[PDB]
Amino acid sequence: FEHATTVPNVPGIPYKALVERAGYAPLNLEITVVSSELTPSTNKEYVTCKFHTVIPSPQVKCCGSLECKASSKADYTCRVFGGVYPFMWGGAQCFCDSENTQLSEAYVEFAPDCTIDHAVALKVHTAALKVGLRIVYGNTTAHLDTFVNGVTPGSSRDLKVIAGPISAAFSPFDHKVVIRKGLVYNYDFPEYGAMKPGAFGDIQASSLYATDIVARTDIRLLKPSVKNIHVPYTQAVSGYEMWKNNSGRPLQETAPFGCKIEVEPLRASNCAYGHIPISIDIPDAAFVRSSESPTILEVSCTVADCIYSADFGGSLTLQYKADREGHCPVHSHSTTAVLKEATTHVTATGSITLHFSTSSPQANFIVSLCGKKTTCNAECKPPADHIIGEPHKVDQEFQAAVSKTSWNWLLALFGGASSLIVVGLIVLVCSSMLINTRR
Amino acid sequence: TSRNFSVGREGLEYVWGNHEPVRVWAQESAPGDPHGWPHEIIIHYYHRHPVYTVIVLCGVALAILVGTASSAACIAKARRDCLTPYALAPNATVPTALAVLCCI
Structure with missing residues (x-):
């Protein structure tokens, strides 16, 4: 048998529904x-981290001249300097006086500690929602994961549950996402090849190994001034370090809907948003003939004292008369009242306590003890506690949220005007007919 | 120190140092009684939903105003066209039978 519900996408709150087939005893449904x-679908662009400025040993073909070449090393900068006469511990390093050429080289590497302290640049496409469900039908519990x-x-x-499209399309991730040591940031990194000096992604590589x-770190090679051999250079700050500071x-802390941002793989877990149209094809054997379940002769609902709060702030006793013992499903036929119980034991004459939760200031709902709908009426006072540590089990409607005293006053005012x-x-038409008969 | 944070029906999560997050949700504990006198009801529903309750109260004020000024306008129109068309006609006489039934 096919049942189409709409489960609120809040993790942990049970959603209760009653499936009634003709000739078959009502079955309790419980979706959590x-x-x-x-x-999301990810695509890794590059890996960035702090760069290691590698300055090789200066080359001095220092009676003659040197030529700058081209190398594939990252940010390979070269410069040829006119007349140097370099010194070391040992005095003059060559013979000709001002015919001495020094070649300064400077490229960029990956720091040795980059295998631990690095960032990964990702592009993430449309996200997919996957849920774990706890369908409880009859006395059988089934755990299952659906897309x-x-x-x-x-x-x-044998449940065959099809999770309908989510009502709201939400994704806490932007198009471009940066992952650093398990922390996820929404950063607009430069594309592969567009390295900006002094910003995130100034050094890029497909992998760490x-x-x-490719790098662009603004290496400027300066003309040596001192007599001792030297490669004076200046450089921009590490874009990775600057981004880390800013x-x-x-x-994980700026996500909406209470999403828990996790890595490996990248995901947003336990997000509370939207509604899910679940469709369950319950197996036939779970249903039982209407003859097998006990039949309620008459029942009546009295409600002890109720508040409308997140938790189960309501109590309800109903005196029933059954001709046979057995188990009967209990359900509240209302969108603003949910029962804590699902099945109960009925024994001839008895009375049972059912706890519920409400968002309206009125227990104005219907309860069914394996059939035999009965109505409740009471006053739900506001709760004394201001803050609770548990989510609201029921949503806030309008006709429910407005109480009957306020409804009576509103209808008194509007109906008085009307x-x-x-x-x-009526005096308009009566006076008009009197005038028409006058002349 | 002390820090004041607003909690709604959707909740709030705060992390204090190296502590597990703690989440808190707000109940509809507005001052007043939803089933008391109308002023207590208005206090409750104004603390809960101010703009909505202002809209509803303005609706009832407009409904009473436009409708007392409409029934009264129709009453005055009927009085005028029951007193003028032949009763107030110069040198004309209207006895009690067709005067006092609506007039005065």
Whole structure:
């Protein structure tokens, strides 16, 4: 049998529904989102970290001249200097006086500690939602993971639950995402090849162990001044370090909907947003004939004292008369009241306590003890506690949220105005007919 | 120190140092009684939803105003066209039978 619900996507809150087939005893349905994963499709561009400025030993063909060449090393900078006469510990390093040429080389590497302290630049496409469900039908519990797309039939044994499309398309990640030691940032990194000196991504490589590193770190080779051999150079600050100082707070702390940002793989777990249209094809054997379940002769609902809060702030006793003992499913036929119980034991004459939760200031709902709908009426006072540590089990509607005293006053005012204008219209027509008969 | 943070029906998560996050949700504990006198009801629903309750109260004020000024306008129109068309006609006499039934 096919049942189409709409489960609120809040992890942990059970969603209760009653499936009634003609000729078959009502079955209790219980859908819980144990966990959720928002996994985007990732694409790694490059890996960046602090650069190691490698200055080789200066070359002095120092009676003659040297030529600058081209190398594939990262940010390979070269410069030829006119007349040097370099010194070391030992005096003059060659013979001709001002015919001495020094070649300064400076490229960029990956720091030795980069295998631990590095960032990964990623582009993430549309995200996919996957949920863990705890469908409880009858007295059988089934755990199962389904894709939230509307077509994939994730099934544990014989449940065949199809998770409909999520009502709201939400993704806490931007197009470009930076991952550094497990912390996820939304950064607009430069593309592969567009290295900006002094900014994030000034040194790029496909991997840490790659030999095709590309860099642009603004290395300016300066003319030596001192007599001792020297490679004077100046450089821009590490873009990785500058970004680390100005990174802001991660997505783990700036995420919406209480999302838990996790890595390996990148995902946003336990996000509370939207509604999921679940469709369950319950196996036939779970249902039982209407003859097998006990039949309620008459029942009546009295509600002890209720508040409308997140937790189960309500109590309810109903006196029933059953002709046979057995188990009967209990359900609240209302969107603003949810029962804590699902099945209960009925024994001839008895009374049972059912705890519920409400968002309206009225227990104005219906309860079914394996059929035999009965109505409750009471006053739900506001809770004394201001802050609780548990999510609200029921959403806040309008006709429910407005109480009956306020409804009575509103209808008194509006109906007074409407009756006033109706009396005005009737005296209008009566006076008009009197005038028409006058002349 | 002390820090004041606003909590709503959706919740709030705060992390203090190297502590596990703790989440808190706000209940509808507005001052007043939703089932008391109208002023207590208005206090409750103004603390809960101010703009909505202002809209509803302005709606009832407009409904009473436009509707008392409409029934009264129609009443005055009927009075005028019951007193003028032949009763107030110069040198004309209207006895009690067709005067006092609506007039005065």
